[PDB]
Chain A
Amino acid sequence: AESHRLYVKGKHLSYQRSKRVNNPNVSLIKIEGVATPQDAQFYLGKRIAYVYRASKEVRGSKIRVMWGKVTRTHGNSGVVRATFRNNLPAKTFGASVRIFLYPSNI
């Protein structure tokens, strides 16, 4: 096919933060097409994978990934807190985060 995308796309935004103290445990995620929390409830628990490049070829491929889940809803507009294993670099606020579809429970 032309389009093999199996994953909704999204934007990384912030770490969770107070007005001053951030808490870079849990990235906050914006999801494309979710405008509302009850839309979120579908996504909670899928596997987010942040994907980027490294010019030094590591495993035989220069494309690297961090994985992680999506835990709970955030705010009324449908931000969704995700926590990766190794926290997102904060180099990327507003970079495209991919939200796969599985675990699949419907």
Chain B
Amino acid sequence: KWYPSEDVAALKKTRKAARPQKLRASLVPGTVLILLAGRFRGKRVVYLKHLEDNTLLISGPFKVNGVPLRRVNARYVIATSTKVSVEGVNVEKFNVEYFAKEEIKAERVEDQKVVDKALIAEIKKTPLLKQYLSASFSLKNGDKPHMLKF
């Protein structure tokens, strides 16, 4: 609470406002996302909530392929066409703060099982779509991602 004491230059009025994010057309909650980057790379998870810090939220569900609840940036994810039903799943229980941080916090696990049950029970409504979230994804030979359709 001193005086500036060594004079500097005050900034100018920055005219760049903060305007909300526009996701691309192919993301609506419940798409199966394939990750690209990170220890979870190339897996297949389920897209639930679009958070406020401009990242998505994804669950494995951790019961299945190993991916827990997680925040994931929009740009590093590939959006398949294969939908599911998220509608019977709760959402708002968590946001940026739930992921703020400073082993495992038993609460986190609890939420994990909560979304786990309902969501898996939804997935069982489609054939093989259980396994299709178990197996990894990878390019095979001759694959030409500029010709592919996800």
Residues of B within 8 A of A104 (CB): 36, 75-78
Tell me if B139 counts as interface (CB < 8 A to partner A).
yes
- Inter-chain contact A103/B138, CB cutoff 8 Å: no
Flag if A101 contacts B24 (CB, 8 Å). Answer: no
B139 engages A5 (CB within 8 Å): yes
Asked whether any CB of chain B lies closer than 8 Å to the CB of A13, the reply is no
B138 touches A4 (CB 8 A): yes
Instruction: Find chain B residues with CB under 8 A from A43 CB.
Output: 146
Q: Are A33 and B135 in contact (CB under 8 A)?
A: no
Distance to closest chain A CB from B144 (angstroms): 4
Count the A-B residue pairs with Cβ separation under 8 angstroms: how many? 53
Chain B, residues 121-150, CB within 8 Å of chain A (1/0): the string is 000000000000001101111111111001
Assess whether B24 is in contact with A6, with CB atoms less than 8 Å apart: no
Report A-chain residues with C-beta under 8 Å of the C-beta of B41: 6
Task: State the CA gap A43–B135 with chains docked (Å).
Answer: 26
Most buried by B among A39, A101, A104, A105: A104
Which parts of A1-52 form the interface with B (CB within 8 Å)?
Answer: 1, 3-8, 33-34, 39, 42-43
- Given contacts A33-B146, A101-B145, whether A3 and B140 have CB atoms under 8 Å apart is yes
Which residues of chain B come closer than 8 Å to A7, judged between CB atoms?
Answer: 139
CB distance from A82 to the nearest CB of B (A): 16
Q: How far is the CA of A103 from the CA of B58 in the complex (A)?
A: 18
A interface with B by C-beta (< 8 Å): 1, 3-8, 33-34, 39, 42-43, 100-106
A-B contact pairs, 7 of them (CB 8 A): A7-B139, A33-B147, A39-B146, A42-B146, A100-B36, A101-B78, A102-B76
